[PDB]
Design an enzyme around this catalytic site. Structure first.
Site, PDB file in Angstrom:
ATOM      1  CB  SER A  75      34.020  10.598   1.054  1.00 60.13           C
ATOM      2  OG  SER A  75      34.208   9.765   2.192  1.00 60.13           O
TER       3      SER A  75
ATOM      4  CG  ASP B  66       3.012   9.726  19.205  1.00 60.95           C
ATOM      5  OD1 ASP B  66       2.146   8.878  18.863  1.00 60.95           O
ATOM      6  OD2 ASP B  66       2.712  10.841  19.695  1.00 60.95           O
TER       7      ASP B  66
ATOM      8  CD  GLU C 185      -3.668  -2.547  -8.726  1.00 66.23           C
ATOM      9  OE1 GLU C 185      -4.282  -3.061  -9.676  1.00 66.23           O
ATOM     10  OE2 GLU C 185      -2.438  -2.783  -8.521  1.00 66.23           O
TER      11      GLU C 185
ATOM     12  CG  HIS D 205      10.921   5.710   2.098  1.00 68.41           C
ATOM     13  ND1 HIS D 205      12.172   5.245   2.459  1.00 68.41           N
ATOM     14  CD2 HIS D 205      10.075   5.332   3.083  1.00 68.41           C
ATOM     15  CE1 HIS D 205      12.095   4.646   3.643  1.00 68.41           C
ATOM     16  NE2 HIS D 205      10.828   4.663   4.041  1.00 68.41           N
TER      17      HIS D 205
HETATM   18  O1  LIG Z   1      -1.038  -6.069 -11.715  1.00 66.37           O
HETATM   19  C1  LIG Z   1      -0.458  -5.449 -10.820  1.00 66.37           C
HETATM   20  N1  LIG Z   1       0.068  -6.037  -9.742  1.00 66.37           N
HETATM   21  C2  LIG Z   1       0.038  -7.487  -9.513  1.00 66.37           C
HETATM   22  C3  LIG Z   1       1.070  -8.249 -10.383  1.00 66.37           C
HETATM   23  C4  LIG Z   1       2.485  -7.883 -10.091  1.00 66.37           C
HETATM   24  C5  LIG Z   1       3.446  -8.763 -10.948  1.00 66.37           C
HETATM   25  C6  LIG Z   1       4.831  -8.695 -10.338  1.00 66.37           C
HETATM   26  N2  LIG Z   1       4.769  -9.164  -8.949  1.00 66.37           N
HETATM   27  C7  LIG Z   1       5.296  -8.472  -7.933  1.00 66.37           C
HETATM   28  O2  LIG Z   1       5.807  -7.363  -8.120  1.00 66.37           O
HETATM   29  C8  LIG Z   1       5.100  -8.986  -6.464  1.00 66.37           C
HETATM   30  C9  LIG Z   1       6.038  -8.710  -5.458  1.00 66.37           C
HETATM   31  C10 LIG Z   1       5.850  -9.143  -4.114  1.00 66.37           C
HETATM   32  C11 LIG Z   1       4.706  -9.816  -3.647  1.00 66.37           C
HETATM   33  I1  LIG Z   1       4.402 -10.437  -1.576  1.00 66.37           I
HETATM   34  C12 LIG Z   1       3.755 -10.042  -4.673  1.00 66.37           C
HETATM   35  C13 LIG Z   1       3.947  -9.648  -6.034  1.00 66.37           C
HETATM   36  C14 LIG Z   1       0.341  -7.742  -8.027  1.00 66.37           C
HETATM   37  O3  LIG Z   1       0.987  -6.852  -7.361  1.00 66.37           O
HETATM   38  O4  LIG Z   1      -0.140  -8.816  -7.616  1.00 66.37           O
HETATM   39  N3  LIG Z   1      -0.471  -4.123 -10.820  1.00 66.37           N
HETATM   40  C15 LIG Z   1      -0.825  -3.383 -12.044  1.00 66.37           C
HETATM   41  C16 LIG Z   1      -0.062  -4.034 -13.228  1.00 66.37           C
HETATM   42  O5  LIG Z   1       1.064  -4.557 -12.983  1.00 66.37           O
HETATM   43  O6  LIG Z   1      -0.574  -3.931 -14.393  1.00 66.37           O
HETATM   44  C17 LIG Z   1      -0.350  -1.957 -11.894  1.00 66.37           C
HETATM   45  C18 LIG Z   1       0.948  -1.534 -12.189  1.00 66.37           C
HETATM   46  C19 LIG Z   1       1.323  -0.182 -12.063  1.00 66.37           C
HETATM   47  C20 LIG Z   1       0.336   0.714 -11.663  1.00 66.37           C
HETATM   48  O7  LIG Z   1       0.635   2.035 -11.528  1.00 66.37           O
HETATM   49  C21 LIG Z   1      -0.959   0.293 -11.381  1.00 66.37           C
HETATM   50  C22 LIG Z   1      -1.317  -1.030 -11.524  1.00 66.37           C
HETATM   51 ZN   LIG Z   2      -4.353  -6.505  -8.514  1.00 65.44          ZN
HETATM   52 ZN   LIG Z   3      -3.527  -6.558 -11.723  1.00 71.04          ZN
END
Ligand SMILES: O=C(N[C@@H](CCCCNC(=O)c1ccc(I)cc1)C(=O)O)N[C@H](C(=O)O)c1ccc(O)cc1
Ligand SMILES: [Zn+2]
Ligand SMILES: [Zn+2]
Ligand SMILES: *[C@@H]1O[C@H](CO)[C@@H](O[C@@H]2O[C@H](CO)[C@@H](O[C@@H]3O[C@H](CO)[C@@H](O)[C@H](O[C@H]4O[C@H](CO)[C@@H](O)[C@H](O)[C@@H]4O)[C@@H]3O)[C@H](O)[C@H]2NC(C)=O)[C@H](O)[C@H]1NC(C)=O
Ligand SMILES: *[C@@H]1O[C@H](CO)[C@@H](O[C@@H]2O[C@H](CO)[C@@H](O[C@@H]3O[C@H](CO)[C@@H](O)[C@H](O[C@H]4O[C@H](CO)[C@@H](O)[C@H](O)[C@@H]4O)[C@@H]3O)[C@H](O)[C@H]2NC(C)=O)[C@H](O)[C@H]1NC(C)=O
Ligand SMILES: O=C(N[C@@H](CCCCNC(=O)c1ccc(I)cc1)C(=O)O)N[C@H](C(=O)O)c1ccc(O)cc1
Ligand SMILES: *[C@@H]1O[C@H](CO)[C@@H](O[C@@H]2O[C@H](CO)[C@@H](O)[C@H](O)[C@H]2NC(C)=O)[C@H](O)[C@H]1NC(C)=O
Ligand SMILES: *[C@@H]1O[C@H](CO)[C@@H](O[C@@H]2O[C@H](CO)[C@@H](O)[C@H](O)[C@H]2NC(C)=O)[C@H](O)[C@H]1NC(C)=O
Ligand SMILES: *[C@@H]1O[C@H](CO)[C@@H](O[C@@H]2O[C@H](CO)[C@@H](O)[C@H](O)[C@H]2NC(C)=O)[C@H](O)[C@H]1NC(C)=O
Ligand SMILES: *[C@@H]1O[C@H](CO)[C@@H](O[C@@H]2O[C@H](CO)[C@@H](O)[C@H](O)[C@H]2NC(C)=O)[C@H](O)[C@H]1NC(C)=O
Ligand SMILES: *[C@@H]1O[C@H](CO)[C@@H](O[C@@H]2O[C@H](CO)[C@@H](O)[C@H](O)[C@H]2NC(C)=O)[C@H](O)[C@H]1NC(C)=O
Ligand SMILES: *[C@@H]1O[C@H](CO)[C@@H](O[C@@H]2O[C@H](CO)[C@@H](O)[C@H](O)[C@H]2NC(C)=O)[C@H](O)[C@H]1NC(C)=O
Ligand SMILES: *[C@@H]1O[C@H](CO)[C@@H](O)[C@H](O)[C@H]1NC(C)=O
Ligand SMILES: *[C@@H]1O[C@H](CO)[C@@H](O)[C@H](O)[C@H]1NC(C)=O
Ligand SMILES: *[C@@H]1O[C@H](CO)[C@@H](O)[C@H](O)[C@H]1NC(C)=O
Ligand SMILES: *[C@@H]1O[C@H](CO)[C@@H](O)[C@H](O)[C@H]1NC(C)=O
Ligand SMILES: *[C@@H]1O[C@H](CO)[C@@H](O)[C@H](O)[C@H]1NC(C)=O
Ligand SMILES: *[C@@H]1O[C@H](CO)[C@@H](O)[C@H](O)[C@H]1NC(C)=O
Ligand SMILES: [Ca+2]
Ligand SMILES: [Ca+2]
Ligand SMILES: [Cl-]
Ligand SMILES: [Cl-]
Ligand SMILES: [Zn+2]
Ligand SMILES: [Zn+2]
Lengths: 694, 694
Positions: free
Chosen positions: A574, A610, A370, A633
């Site tokens: 519009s 469905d 991920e 989307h």
């Molecule tokens: O670390 C990541 N995600 C964490 C941190 C995200 C920080 C910002 N938080 C949010 O966007 C967020 C929004 C709604 C909720 I409910 C929870 C967190 C997460 O989703 O917990 N994803 C990584 C990164 O940001 O380096 C990532 C980012 C882009 C990608 O293509 C693959 C991996």
């Molecule tokens: Zn993560």
């Molecule tokens: Zn992460």
């Protein structure tokens, strides 16, 4: 009885705590042996827990790693080429882990190699508006400069994209205490703040939903044809490296040129936050030099996929997924989510051993890589896209269960709003002061809806996690929920120890959730949603909630356009068709809801189920959004300026963005009208899927 | 009883004859008032016949028409610029119709305007290999020349594309008696041959499945945003005009330069068939000049859509469609098919009035503007794509019911092969000498399969008719069937009076089918297929038949590649993955067939029916074929050299085609390997949709 209450009561805080401890003793970096051994452990345990089948799905994808014998660092060099200051080669390890091996040093994954040397320019958060301010208002030119930017506000990959388009020859990212040091709390190990030697790891790709950079569209299986590196998707073209605030202070303290344009540009370090370019008079001849030697390499990754076959509708899939790979120990990201998933699987398996099966099939996934671009979930979805699009009911994500201890945070499709409200009314609040009250009550109190009194805030899905392929590419209803802080301006920046070596089991157990009660509440929300989706006779989706938001997003995009009334007159722009489509959707959805309430006939039921399942799918345009073919989307896409944030009517939004700067206004407004037609058509076509079928 | 025999017995030859007469008294050109009045008549009658709902769906699409006050013609001009010979302004009208108005004169629809003057080069059928022979072997340069080509062998739009890429400045198409005059038969009105003044109308677009040139992807509805003409899809860039063989003889008789390279270049006129460029010595100073003044204009078209709602599965659609618009009277194309459709609707409506309904919903369509690019069916499918892809079981086309009186001709997906064989064994042969024998017996005798003894020939679907969007874009199982001639080398050229003013009711009634027995047999085949698809409890598709053809097409594409053994060694080009996928498909299909035979449970039935319906859909790649985004089926696409012919594994076929001429062999073989990976992946993914679902 085998009902939702039995499922929920089987979940235990103490099991979550045991699993979190078990998952966070050693690093589990994607593509490493340790992460493969954890995958095998999970596969074994999910079998023991009682799933019908549990397999590993593997792929060979592009990953990125520092060179162990040629470390990355940044210098300040004098006119003689002596390196007079060097940034750190590693974060000081936390207590009792100073002897753990294989902690990856801080690096920006997918950075190219290089040793650029130049003058610094400070670009605040390196957002689109920060670069507008520099270039348009302050007349500062970043071309050929090294940019230094603070982390926060937007995804780091957008920062790097912005710096590249500004002509930067390298980027230095750092964590400012303004954004990563909460006042009054101590630094790790004595509190949950970031120490000055701490550094946030993370990829800097701009994949726009593609998955593995070498195989867009198709799974990276054994016979896959790969693009050459020069044609790979989303790789940055300039070197990038992250540093902590002790090191940043050394880089920023000598900065000269222009003052910051205002206070929103100043962080909390004791420096002027001058924008540059370059250093003040005395040090005008010193330069900054990066040394980046990381390598991209195709590496095997492993997803664990467990199946619990449905008793009645085995060809309908409810998917609960979260990733397993971590930058280092993953105490919060992702193992706080993975431990919750493990206990949910255990609970469903307990019911299964007593003879119960869900109505629909439940799939459980432990995704790999991920952190390197949603690679494991995206490759698997590319492999299985035909099954998912004709059979996928819903996807519930399960990364970090906690990022604070204040209240619930939920992002989901409007089709799940009613489900989330109803479930949280039946769950106990874990919060101090709300004992004996519902989670709905506490959540609504602490995070009120900005539109409706007596309702909680639920946000749009963006991206930056593994739901992206399921929602934005395939159009499967998706949701996520976690416990969060009260720190609104920091809602996209991460908690202080995000992606650092300090995110450990002890962090969680000492400072976030000692009783594991917030973990347990998140397990009841995620698990409860999965249970209802997999067991409810009629799918628990309310199409009328989509009609309400479509009106809100239509009003919003209309209001943006109406900032340009003279152009709307000149080019006859519009929004009538879009409002017409939204009105039709509202009418048809209301009639469908009436029929859904008004029908012993399992054909009509499934016909109607469905219709509900394929409603999210109707918002998919097979031609994708402009230059982003894997974001399909039409209502939601990750913001083009911030991958973490969702944007509504993104095709029209991006056509309008900065339109007063386009050289050919006729062509620019033509494209706005084209996006209005695509959006009105798609909304009307989605509505028509809810009409009587014949 | 209400069964297939009751349905079939209600069909009457004499009703078909009445309807054909009624449909062919006046021209019904797309976009004209006469064709709109016919649409309203059909809508009214289908309501009377008993359909549940019958609506008109209209669109505003780009059509093309000659200028009534500035006629198109071709001249030979002398050095003074005197036009010494002119081609005809109209075909002599047939007996008793010399006073009908609104007969459109012969023209090539979508030709641009222009008055190019130049020397002629004769290019045979203007096929890819004809242009290879000219340029590579004979060293004749077409740049700046007017090309003259005989109709036949391939779609005329491919001729024009080929002539354009060769640098021609105009194209003259003509009907050679070698291809349009059967020996021993008299010219119309005394026989079914083409007179020397007869001319074949027809569009010369290269749409590749796009539909209306101005709205690719989206329906041309009231609020549609349209491309400007310069960005329209598939329009030719040089003027084009068709002529009869009296006029062609005048153009060809003076031709000089090189002799034809061989006898396959000579037609039946009394001319040398010299290739040119230009005329022999005495006439070396004369030139040919085109005068084309046709205009493209957005015009409203109307489809008639009738619904017969299913009793049990109303959300599953079986579609019977054919077009209504004709170039002039449409005696064969399309009204011989439309009259069959009208009698099928009548028959189903008779059963419906007695209280019967089909299991599944049947949709009946009278499409408009087929002749101008499949516009009506494609726009409607773009509008309804979400309903069709989740609910479309099958599409049966119904254009011309007869193009000869010799035997049956069928093209369909392999999923329908077993259905066609079984139905035709239950139908009576109409053929002389086979009284009391089955249609299967006569058809097998007259058109034997080239692989299997005791079986008839069934061909691949290509394009050039309204099934194209349903099959090649959306992946809905499709079929078509008609009566045909015994004239194999002419299987893509059309019958002699194809698209001429002479294709009338009298043509059919006097020379093709005086008793309407071949029409009736075609009504029983098309109608019978629709009945079985809409009524069979288990869908009448056999996945094992797809496994058999996939092996055949894999062997074929492997054999093409193996003409280049040294390159396959150098670039490690392996077909192993593709054969592996085909073997897996064969195994899985065999196991699925066993389960299908081995299951009172309507969920398992419908689960299994959904597996059958979505199998064709699994061959769709959402990214489309290279530079042809609306051809998405990975197994079949219209040939890139001849839109009428189907090609199997088209992505690999086109990557291999003429590969020994590519300048960068590494890049060319890389693309072959990429297409092998996409094909192997898609076949394996299609196979997996037939595995147990969980
Ligand atoms: O670390 C990541 N995600 C964490 C941190 C995200 C920080 C910002 N938080 C949010 O966007 C967020 C929004 C709604 C909720 I409910 C929870 C967190 C997460 O989703 O917990 N994803 C990584 C990164 O940001 O380096 C990532 C980012 C882009 C990608 O293509 C693959 C991996
Ligand atoms: Zn993560
Ligand atoms: Zn992460
Ligand atoms: C929301 O749902 C409503 C249905 O409740 C749907 O209404 C449809 O609107 C279309 C587009 O406006 C109507 O189209 C008209 O159709 C008639 C024949 O039915 C035509 O004659 C009309 O064309 C004439 O008028 C035009 C406008 O001035 C001219 O441009 C044109 O050249 C003609 O002179 C016109 O095409 C259609 O009848 C209704 N359908 C109904 C009421 O059932 C609406 O379109 C939906 N919204 C969206 C965004 O889809
Ligand atoms: C047709 O169906 C069959 C299943 O009956 C399916 O077989 C699968 O083939 C793949 C690809 O060959 C196998 O992949 C192997 O998986 C093992 C672990 O299971 C890996 O260790 C293997 O990798 C090693 O060996 C490779 C080849 O030398 C090396 O390149 C690699 O670096 C490793 O050292 C390899 O990935 C898979 O196990 C089977 N699955 C089975 C038998 O269930 C086949 O792929 C299908 N055909 C198509 C076109 O899909
Ligand atoms: O006239 C057309 N079709 C006729 C004539 C086709 C002549 C070649 N015949 C076949 O391809 C064929 C194959 C199998 C069967 I069963 C029947 C006919 C038809 O399908 O009956 N379509 C027209 C045209 O060829 O000008 C056409 C062509 C392309 C296009 O985008 C739109 C319309
Ligand atoms: C995490 O828990 C797992 C499962 O309980 C432990 O793996 C087991 O270890 C024991 C003792 O070494 C073995 O006998 C079993 O075969 C393992 N079971 C598996 C892998 O399913 C693992 O030791 C724990 N990890 C940590 C760091 O405590
Ligand atoms: C920063 O690190 C660099 C690289 O290791 C140091 O420069 C090296 O110093 C050694 C021994 O003194 C020399 O032999 C190398 O040739 C130097 N390499 C380069 C690339 O300059 C530098 O001393 C360090 N600076 C500080 C302040 O510690
Ligand atoms: C959430 O709960 C509400 C209140 O129970 C559900 O709405 C009720 O649903 C039943 C069954 O259709 C109706 O008879 C009631 O009239 C509804 N009450 C209302 C709308 O106030 C609602 O369906 C639940 N949402 C889900 C399950 O997604
Ligand atoms: C084709 O048949 C139709 C239907 O029988 C004829 O249209 C009818 O004409 C009569 C007499 O003019 C009218 O009373 C009816 O209203 C028409 N019915 C419709 C349109 O549904 C039409 O006359 C015939 N056309 C030809 C050329 O014979
Ligand atoms: C072919 O048609 C052209 C165009 O009508 C004829 O040329 C015209 O003749 C008239 C009267 O004789 C002149 O006034 C026009 O100026 C001519 N127009 C052009 C464009 O040349 C020509 O005579 C016809 N040729 C034959 C053999 O019938
Ligand atoms: C075409 O007819 C054949 C012969 O009746 C059908 O195949 C039989 O189907 C029944 C029902 O499954 C089986 O019990 C027999 O064993 C089959 N006979 C065979 C394969 O020789 C076949 O299903 C029909 N095809 C259709 C309806 O598409
Ligand atoms: C890493 O650096 C070492 C030491 O200089 C070098 O020998 C090796 O090529 C590098 N490894 C890579 C590029 O994977
Ligand atoms: C910025 O500097 C570069 C490098 O000299 C120059 O080519 C470019 O035109 C400059 N841009 C602006 C907007 O001043
Ligand atoms: C847990 O909640 C308490 C009480 O409000 C707070 O002081 C503490 O800092 C919280 N921990 C975290 C990590 O937010
Ligand atoms: C057709 O030709 C006439 C007569 O010369 C001309 O006046 C008119 O512009 C043309 N019609 C078009 C281009 O539609
Ligand atoms: C054909 O003639 C044109 C026009 O003079 C010329 O430019 C082109 O190069 C020629 N091509 C060949 C293959 O001889
Ligand atoms: C009808 O069949 C007869 C007998 O073979 C043949 O002579 C006649 O030409 C056929 N008509 C057509 C149009 O093929
Ligand atoms: Ca991929
Ligand atoms: Ca269109
Ligand atoms: Cl999450
Ligand atoms: Cl047909
Ligand atoms: Zn036709
Ligand atoms: Zn035709």
């Amino acid at each position: 009885k085998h009902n939702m209450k039995a499922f929920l009561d089987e979940l235990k805080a103490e099991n979550i705590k045991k699993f979190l401890y078990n998952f966070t003793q050693i690093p589990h970096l994607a593509g490493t042996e340790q992460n493969f051994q954890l995958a095998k452990q999970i596969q074994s345990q999910w079998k023991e827990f009682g799933l019908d089948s549990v397999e590993l799905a593997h792929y060979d994808v592009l990953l990125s790693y520092p060179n162990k014998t040629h470390p990355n660092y940044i210098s300040i060099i004098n006119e003689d080429g002596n390196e007079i200051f060097n940034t750190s080669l590693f974060e000081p390890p936390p207590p009792g882990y100073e002897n753990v091996s294989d902690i990856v040093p801080p690096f920006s994954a997918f950075s190219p190699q290089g040793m650029p040397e130049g003058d610094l320019v400070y670009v605040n958060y390196a957002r689109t508006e920060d670069f507008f301010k520099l270039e348009r208002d302050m007349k500062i030119n970043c071309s050929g400069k090294i940019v230094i930017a603070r982390y926060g506000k937007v995804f780091r990959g957008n920062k790097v994209k912005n710096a590249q388009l500004a002509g930067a020859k390298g980027v230095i990212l750092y964590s400012d205490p303004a954004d990563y040091f909460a006042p009054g709390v101590k630094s790790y190990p004595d509190g949950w703040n970031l120490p000055g030697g701490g550094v946030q790891r993370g990829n800097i790709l701009n994949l726009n939903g593609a998955g593995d950079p070498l195989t867009p569209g198709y799974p990276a299986n054994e016979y896959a044809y790969r693009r050459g590196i020069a044609e790979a998707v989303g790789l940055p073209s300039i070197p990038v490296h992250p540093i902590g605030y002790y090191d940043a202070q050394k880089l920023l303290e000598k900065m000269g040129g222009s003052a910051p344009p205002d206070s929103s540009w100043r962080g909390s370090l004791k420096v002027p936050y001058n924008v540059g370019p370059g250093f003040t008079g005395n040090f005008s001849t010193q330069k900054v030099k990066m040394h980046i030697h990381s390598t991209n390499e195709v590496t095997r990754i492993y997803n664990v996929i467990g199946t619990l076959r449905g008793a009645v509708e085995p060809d309908r899939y409810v998917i609960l997924g979260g990733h397993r790979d971590s930058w280092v120990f993953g105490g919060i990201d992702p193992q706080s989510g993975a431990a919750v998933v493990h206990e949910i699987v255990r609970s469903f398996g307990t019911l299964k051993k007593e003879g119960w099966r869900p109505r629909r099939t439940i799939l459980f996934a432990s995704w790999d890589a991920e952190e390197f671009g949603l690679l494991g979930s995206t490759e698997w979805a590319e492999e299985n896209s035909r099954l998912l699009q004709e059979r996928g009911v819903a996807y519930i994500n399960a990364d970090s269960s906690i990022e604070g201890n204040y209240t619930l945070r939920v992002d989901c499709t409007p089709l799940m709003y009613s489900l989330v409200h109803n479930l949280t009314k039946e769950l106990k609040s874990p919060d101090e002061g709300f004992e004996g009250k519902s989670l709905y009550e506490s959540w609504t109190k602490k995070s009120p809806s900005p539109e409706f009194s007596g309702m909680p805030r639920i946000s749009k899905l963006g991206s930056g996690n593994d739901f992206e392929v399921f929602f934005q590419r395939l159009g499967i209803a998706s949701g996520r929920a976690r416990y969060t802080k009260n720190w609104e301006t920091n809602k996209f920046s991460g908690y202080p120890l995000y992606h650092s070596v300090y995110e450990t089991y002890e962090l969680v157990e000492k400072f976030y959730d000692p009783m594991f009660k917030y973990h347990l509440t998140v397990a009841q929300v995620r698990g409860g949603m999965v249970f209802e989706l997999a067991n409810s006779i009629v799918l628990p989706f309310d199409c009328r909630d989509y009609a309400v938001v479509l009106r809100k997003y239509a009003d919003k995009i209309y209001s943006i356009s109406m900032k340009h009334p003279q152009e709307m007159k000149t080019y006859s722009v519009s929004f009538d068709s879009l409002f017409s489509a939204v009105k039709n959707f509202t009418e048809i959805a209301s009639k469908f809801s009436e029929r859904l309430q008004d029908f012993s006939n399992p054909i009509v039921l499934r016909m109607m189920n469905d219709q509900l399942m394929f409603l999210e799918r109707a918002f998919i345009d097979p031609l994708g959004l402009p230059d982003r073919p894997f974001y399909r989307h039409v209502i939601y896409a990750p913001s083009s300026h911030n991958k973490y944030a969702g944007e509504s009517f993104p095709g029209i939004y991006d056509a309008l963005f900065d339109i007063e700067s386009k050289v050919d206004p006729s062509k620019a407004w033509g494209e706005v009208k084209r996006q209005i037609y695509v959006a009105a058509f798609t909304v009307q076509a989605a509505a028509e899927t809810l009409s009587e079928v014949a």
